[PDB]
């Protein structure tokens, strides 16, 4: 998995094909998932409080 | 029922009027089916050759009442003429009378602002408000008749 490159079965055709784009989006979705999980934590805890 | 609506499409105008009266008795239960066929009932109200135009107008006005469109219900109830009795203790008649008084008071208030545009008040709307004021006077409810006369801007009925 070093420097890109991938010759065809026997036709001589490299398949090296990629781009560099660190995405705010993936970390963003991770943030949202963790924050929503903790929102649900608070919701369940404070619901337990209301029934008490 | 699509059987009464089918009878309205037939050329026996009197039988179509009979189907319309059958849908009238049933207007309270069958209004969602009759609402799809309003243009046929409107065409029967517009037709000058039809002797039972007021009954077509009364069915249309009941359908618009159940649709919640009180303004169109009032316009068609005014079209029904003698078949719209102010004496009837029906929820339909009470709501339309209240709306008729409100529209009449609104039109009279505007006609008094615009000294230059005589808003043509429908004489049928005036005749319903007259009959209602006369009913209130006959019932001994003079305070209500005075309140309505003040809202309607009718000095003559206030004196009466």
């Amino acid at each position: 998995k070093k420097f890109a490159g991938t010759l065809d079965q026997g036709a001589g055709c490299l398949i090296i094909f990629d781009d560099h784009k660190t995405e705010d989006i993936y970390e963003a979705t991770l943030d949202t998932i963790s924050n929503v999980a903790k929102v649900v934590d608070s919701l369940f805890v404070r619901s337990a409080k209301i029934m008490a | 029922a699509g059987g009464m609506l089918a009878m309205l499409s037939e050329h026996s105008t009197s039988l179509k009027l009979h189907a319309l009266s059958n849908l009238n008795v049933y207007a309270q239960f069958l209004w969602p089916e009759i609402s799809t066929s309003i243009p046929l009932l409107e065409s029967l109200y517009e037709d000058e050759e039809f002797s039972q135009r007021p009954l077509a107008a009364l069915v249309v006005s009941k359908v618009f009442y159940f649709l919640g469109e009180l303004n169109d219900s009032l316009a068609y109830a005014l079209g029904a003429g003698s078949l719209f009795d102010v004496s009837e203790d029906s929820d339909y008649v009470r709501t339309l009378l209240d709306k008729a008084i409100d529209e009449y008071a609104s039109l009279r208030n505007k006609s008094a602002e615009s000294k230059e545009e005589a808003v043509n008040i429908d004489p049928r709307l005036e005749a319903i408000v007259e009959r209602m004021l006369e009913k209130c006077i006959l019932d001994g409810r003079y305070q209500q008749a005075m309140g309505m006369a003040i809202e309607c801007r009718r000095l003559d009925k206030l004196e009466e």
Partner: protein
């Protein structure tokens, strides 16, 4: 209304099923498939077993399955003469639908294949159909040239300014509240 609420007061009519199937056929011709299936819903199991109602159901099956050859063949197995009119109208609608599919599918089609798919008996039949209903079709060297749309099947092939100003609507309407 006589067929729905009065069924508990009137003996069953022998003309109920043919007329119901004819309405189903009209709905299929009009492409009112939703109403067609709601009517089938309203029908009982015994009615579905009727030759006319079963014929309508099979015709709908073929039309959905695309077995237009089966529809045009069943035109021969029609049980009652009153249907022939709606069956011919269904055949016209089926030919129109086939033409619509062919325009999107193939860039070019051989005239022999064009006849075969639309089941035109004679060359002049296909020529007349093309000339009247679909003038946009170009006949070159014996093959029907379907003028495929400039950008349709391909994805992300629409206007840029309009999409991006859709984003304008989103953004501006969003924060102006803020």
């Amino acid at each position: 209304p006589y067929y729905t609420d009065a069924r508990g007061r009137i003996p069953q009519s022998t003309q109920e099923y043919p007329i119901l199937g004819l309405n189903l056929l009209r709905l299929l011709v009009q492409n009112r498939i939703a109403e067609f299936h709601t009517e089938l819903e309203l029908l009982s199991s015994t009615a579905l077993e009727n030759p006319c109602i079963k014929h309508a159901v099979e015709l709908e099956q073929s039309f959905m399955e695309g077995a237009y050859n089966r529809v045009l063949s069943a035109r021969q197995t029609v049980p009652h003469e009153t249907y022939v009119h709606f069956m011919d109208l269904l055949a016209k609608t089926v030919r129109d639908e086939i033409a619509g599919c062919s325009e999107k599918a193939y860039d070019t089609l051989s005239v022999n294949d064009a006849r075969q798919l639309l089941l035109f008996s004679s060359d002049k039949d296909l020529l007349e159909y093309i000339k009247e209903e679909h003038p946009e079709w170009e006949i070159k060297d014996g093959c029907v040239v379907f003028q495929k749309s400039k950008d349709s099947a391909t994805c992300k092939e629409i206007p840029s300014l309009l999409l991006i100003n859709q984003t304008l609507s989103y953004a501006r309407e969003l924060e102006r509240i803020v």
